Design a protein around this nucleic acid. Structure first.
Ligand SMILES: [Zn+2]
Lengths: 84, 37, 141, 200, 129, 83
RNA sequence: UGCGACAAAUGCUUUC
RNA sequence: UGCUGUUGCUGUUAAAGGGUUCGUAGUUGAACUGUGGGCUG
């Protein structure tokens, strides 16, 4: 304690525990990833919350199982979060 | 009659636009020759 | 859903403040436009077109890459649907309910929901006629 | 007739000025001797060049005006063009600004409905600021209203670009006042998503 | 639904002042709200405030100094001629020695004392004391 | 400070105290209001003659927020260190 | 029909 | 006589919220085009 709070300049601990539309300025929760392939090893950009079918070009084309939140990635692929 | 009077007077502007495009291309051709020499 | 019913839910997307492409996106704007038109010819509606580009194609917010919106691009190319997208889906829902109700005449809950949907169609068609997106004598069945 | 004079306005090429001739000279010599600029400079030309002296700076600012038709052309090579022109003018900072028109706000409600929003002073002034800091983007904006009655605008930039733009912020603020007659202040934000301000 | 942005903001400020808070967040904002706050600031009833941009109707953070008793809007915005200032003063102000009625006129938004000096009427927006 | 007649003299008797936290007048019937004096200390660690005095209104104490109010008052006054 | 000069809020020495 | 209430009334239990929804006239309806500047005292 012993420290006041400025509504205009909140701390990181308080701002992190907020709904995306309850922050001082609202913003997204999602991001993009670079994803490899099982036994094919190609490059595809996949949304973190994808709900349609994402397929590998010229391959088995089965990845990105959709859920009620973030999509699940098949164990045969490596993923890396893209910047920005 | 009103429709036929409007149609020609509002669809002869295509020829005018074609004239404008052709004129500009000729000026560019002139500028391209100027850059040639 | 607050127009009809007792729902008070607040679940939607939140657009970012920074409207610039992430700088790893190498697709040119003219390729994105051709990319939108091809998906329309396959038969997909504009709301489904945006999701296909977002999910497996790297393009979030087509408007930020190419300065235009998806429906504006389709209107320019002559690929816009004859009836607005939201009106098409509401009419399809009412048709499926009416087909169900002739076999099941005692389903009084479904009769109640049909009155709500038909009121929504008349309210929506009223707006589209005013902004001249529908013929002045469209007259839902 | 001078081949390098091709890269100027056809009105000003008749009796060119000293600073415009030097910039036009550098532009023509750059078309042939650069990989990235070889495929964009053939179609480019410049309206005018104006120099601005910043008080207590020991550096000058070269502001280059160009027509708005080449906005997307300049954006593609804004970084390479800026550095190359700076390597030819020691002790100077260059600034590529497009020439925009402003419609005065009408006093009639019917006229106000027909104003092109691209030509409002609100849209024009913020586009000028983006031009001067183009590799960076604005991540936030605030206005502070003092008890005396002055309102001051603060623009926040990403902290990842501090090392590349911090030494130019004093010149940017001065030129902005010279062009738009409005004040501006600058700050940096690490993690702009959570609105966290980095005070070095 | 929300019908008046100005009435919503003034109610929020008054409640925070009654509860002894030091800062209050106002959402959403508008041009009319900012002008009203500047009239309050000029007479010393609030401190500094900050406007935050979010590409929508923004937000305002206001600093309170404890000197505000009540602020509120008047709805609907009745017309007030230069001869009606006395009537409005006796009806909604605690006394004739302090407190202000805020109006919008052809010359801008101002308090009743400034409006009377310049011989102009208008519509009533709110009050504070 | 107070009301002046415009004749030159004060006509307002008993200018009241103002709560440090909330800047509100303290009435004569507020029997929960308190005044606290804190000793000043010299460099050697021995107290000094001077003292620091503050007042808290009764409403804050009954709500149970006087402790929080006292902390922020002393931090601003520099009586104690925040960290 | 030809010719001269200057603009252009969106690169024709361009795109497909 | 603020016991007709625009200023200015009441509606859990004193008199008084329609059993619940849909809906047309009617009433009400979010933000934005917008700090003029430079020289003297
Ligand atoms: Zn594969």
């Amino acid at each position: 304690g012993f420290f006041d709070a400025d509504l205009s300049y909140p701390t990181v601990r308080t701002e992190r525990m907020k709904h995306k539309r309850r922050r001082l300025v609202q913003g997204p929760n999602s991001y993009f990833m670079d994803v490899s392939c099982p036994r094919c090893r190609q490059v595809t950009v996949v949304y973190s919350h994808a709900t349609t079918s994402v397929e590998c070009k010229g391959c088995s084309k089965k990845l990105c199982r959709p859920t009620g939140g973030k999509a699940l990635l098949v164990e045969g692929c490596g993923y890396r979060r893209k910047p920005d | 009659q009103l429709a036929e009077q409007l149609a020609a007077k509002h669809l002869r502007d295509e020829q005018n636009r074609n004239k404008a495009r052709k004129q500009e291309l000729k000026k560019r051709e002139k500028e391209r020759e100027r850059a040639r020499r | 859903v607050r127009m009809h019913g007792n729902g008070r839910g607040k679940a939607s997307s939140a657009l970012p403040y920074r409207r610039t492409p992430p700088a790893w996106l190498k697709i040119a704007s003219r390729n994105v436009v051709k990319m939108v038109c091809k998906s329309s010819r396959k038969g997909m509606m504009p709301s489904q077109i945006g999701m296909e580009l977002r999910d497996s194609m790297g393009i979030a917010q087509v408007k930020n890459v190419t300065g235009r919106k998806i429906l504006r691009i389709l209107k320019h190319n002559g690929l816009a649907p004859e009836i607005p997208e939201d009106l098409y889906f509401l009419v399809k829902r009412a048709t499926q309910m009416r087909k169900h109700l002739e076999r099941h005449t005692t389903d009084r809950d479904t009769k109640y929901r049909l009155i709500l949907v038909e009121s929504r169609i008349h309210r929506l068609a009223r707006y589209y006629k005013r902004v001249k997106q529908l013929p002045p004598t469209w007259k839902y069945e | 007739m001078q081949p390098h004079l091709r890269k100027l306005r056809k009105l000003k090429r008749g009796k060119p000025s000293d600073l415009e001739e030097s910039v036009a000279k550098a532009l023509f010599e750059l078309e042939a001797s650069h990989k990235t600029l070889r495929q964009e400079l053939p179609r480019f030309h410049v309206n005018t060049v104006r120099e601005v002296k910043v008080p207590r700076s020991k550096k000058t600012v070269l502001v280059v005006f160009y027509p708005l038709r080449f906005l997307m052309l300049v954006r593609k090579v804004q970084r390479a063009l800026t550095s190359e022109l700076e390597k030819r003018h020691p002790g100077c900072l260059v600034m590529l600004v497009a020439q925009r028109q402003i419609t005065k706000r009408p006093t009639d409600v019917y006229k106000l409905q027909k104003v092109q929003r691209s030509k409002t002073s609100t849209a024009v002034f913020e586009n000028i600021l983006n031009d001067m800091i183009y590799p960076s983007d604005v991540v936030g904006r605030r206005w502070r209203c003092r008890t005396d009655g002055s309102k001051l605008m603060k623009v926040f930039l990403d902290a990842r670009d501090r090392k590349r733009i911090e030494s130019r912020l004093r010149a940017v603020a001065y030129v902005y006042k010279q062009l738009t007659h409005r004040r501006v202040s600058f700050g940096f934000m690490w993690n702009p998503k959570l609105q966290q301000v980095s005070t070095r | 639904t929300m019908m008046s942005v100005l009435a919503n903001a003034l109610r929020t400020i008054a409640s925070a002042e009654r509860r002894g808070k030091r800062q209050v967040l106002i959402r959403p904002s508008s041009k009319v709200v900012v002008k009203f706050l500047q009239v309050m600031q000029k007479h010393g009833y609030i401190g500094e405030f900050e406007i935050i941009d979010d590409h929508r109707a923004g937000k305002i953070v206001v600093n309170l100094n404890g000197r505000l008793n009540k602020c509120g809007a008047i709805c609907p915005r009745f017309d007030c001629a230069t001869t009606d200032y006395e009537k409005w003063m006796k009806n909604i102000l605690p006394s004739r020695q302090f407190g202000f009625v805020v109006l919008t006129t052809s010359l801008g938004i101002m308090d009743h004392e400034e409006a009377r000096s310049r011989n102009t009427g208008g519509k009533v927006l709110g009050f504070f004391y | 400070i107070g009301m002046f007649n415009e004749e030159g003299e004060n006509v307002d008797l008993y200018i009241p105290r103002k709560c440090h936290a909330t800047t509100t007048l303290i009435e004569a019937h507020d029997h929960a209001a308190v005044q606290i004096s804190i000793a000043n200390v010299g460099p050697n660690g021995v107290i000094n003659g001077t003292t620091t005095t503050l007042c808290i209104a009764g409403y804050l104490r009954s709500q149970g927020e006087s402790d929080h109010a006292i902390n922020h008052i002393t931090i601003d006054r520099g009586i104690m260190r925040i960290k």
